[model samples]
Target: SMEQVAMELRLTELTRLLRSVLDQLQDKDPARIFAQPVSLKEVPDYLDHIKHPMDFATMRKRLEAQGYKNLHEFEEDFDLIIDNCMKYNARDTVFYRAAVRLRDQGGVVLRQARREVDSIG
Candidate 1:
């Protein structure tokens, strides 16, 4: 019985943190959310969900296209996000929507944008 209680205690917190992840991140699109790097440990499940820029080839395209400079400008006005473990639910805030305006942005549109950037580069 004690073992069961302990199990419940651990699982219950996991459940809550999982809930918090979706609660905090309102965007439903995985392609938009997973466009950047996340510690694999931080969101193992989301690794399966999010889309965009996981590979060097793809990442390079996006950065070059964006001019990849002064990106620090958007880096401010911080939102206090959590990192690792329960932290992911704690983590992932701010920025984006800028990424979302493109239709089917994470897939084909993102690809097209990268192509456009490369052509200019």
Candidate 2:
């Protein structure tokens, strides 16, 4: 549980951001007259099929499996596989920025932070 708590602390900022977009849950003890579903549905558009390389299922698994020594180790990995090394792209920036911030912390801290992230997936 201590490990769980440590990771939660590291990920607190992210979790807070996630919750900020959510409505305050209705109090269950009774005076509540109405509540909306936690999320709403809308017709999908471009983003519906935009699952690219940086999509979490593909990226994080491959990154950890690829066994990079550090954040920049991807220079070789990307160059060998993806054309143009996919440099300076939106997908690249978000993935690396989030990952590097995670990696910058200690490994134990990462496992701790990851425990929280995994819950969402």
Candidate 3:
């Protein structure tokens, strides 16, 4: 139960962070703004594949088994892997639009995470 709550909170926080990151880039580069848009058809799969908080422990262990000694190590490699995957998938206009919407409402999500974390803390 706790893990589930944490996972949800983490996802919420991460999604907000991603939206913020996207927003900052959107104005700077219109050509690449929606270049990596994820599609409607692929939304479910993409969400499923995105790393969740509950999976962090297991993923960390798996990385350790593969020679990663810490989260930093795993994160650097994970970033590279995810970046390549996104590039390979190309940009989806639908996904980019959805992401923009999500980013616009990011404050609500961030507040939710703050409340949850504060309550738990």
Candidate 4:
């Protein structure tokens, strides 16, 4: 159940990240690049497990029902999801850099997940 939830969440996050990047690209509209189509092949196999973010959200809710209250409690599972994604295909350096910056600025969001778990417990 944790695996399923992690897979769904990871896919949802990845899709959002991809879409955000694409939106930024659209706004920029660089001369060398027009519109870049994202092929299913371009997406890693992990993402194929879920149809959409809502599906992932549903899986997350199911996991919550199973007592997975927060991201902190599920850190290893979440990390495993990320690791699988990287192993399947390396992530964009820019995205990784942005994540690091966000973490530095706002602290770890996983901690918030832990707080959520605390409330549930």
The RMSD of every model to the true structure, in order and in angstroms, is 20.1, 16.0, 12.7, 11.9
In candidate 4, what are the lDDT values of residues 21-102, reduced to their tens digit? 3243233323212122223575555456533212223334444454343344344433433333334433566434433343
Better of 2 and 4 by lDDT: 4
Q: Which stretches in model 4 have alpha-carbon errors above 4 Å? A: 1-59, 69-73, 91-107, 112-121
Find the 10 residues in a row with the least total lDDT in model 3.
52-61
The local distance difference test score of model 4 is 0.40
* Most accurate candidate by lDDT: 3
Model 1 over residues 1-121: C-alpha lDDT tens digits?
9998976655454344323332223243444443345556765776554432142233334333442332121121011111122232332433334233322332343344345434533
Candidate 1 lDDT at 90 equals: 31
- Superposed Cα deviation of residue 94, candidate 2 (Å): 24
Model 2 lDDT per residue over 1-121, tens place: 9998876554554445223211222112022211221112441442343332232223334443434433234333322223211232254564334333332332343344346545653
Q: Mind giving the per-residue lDDT tens digits that candidate 3 earns over 1-121?
A: 9998987666555444434433443444344423443443756666555443212234334533444432244345434333434534436754345344534554354455445445644
lDDT of 4 at 12: 58
Root mean square deviation (Cα) for candidate 4: 11.9
Candidate 2 — which residues are off by over 4 angstroms? 1-59, 84-121
Query: Model 1, which residues run further than 4 Å from truth?
Result: 27-121
Give lDDT: candidate 1, residue 15.
40
lDDT of each: 0.36, 0.33, 0.43, 0.40
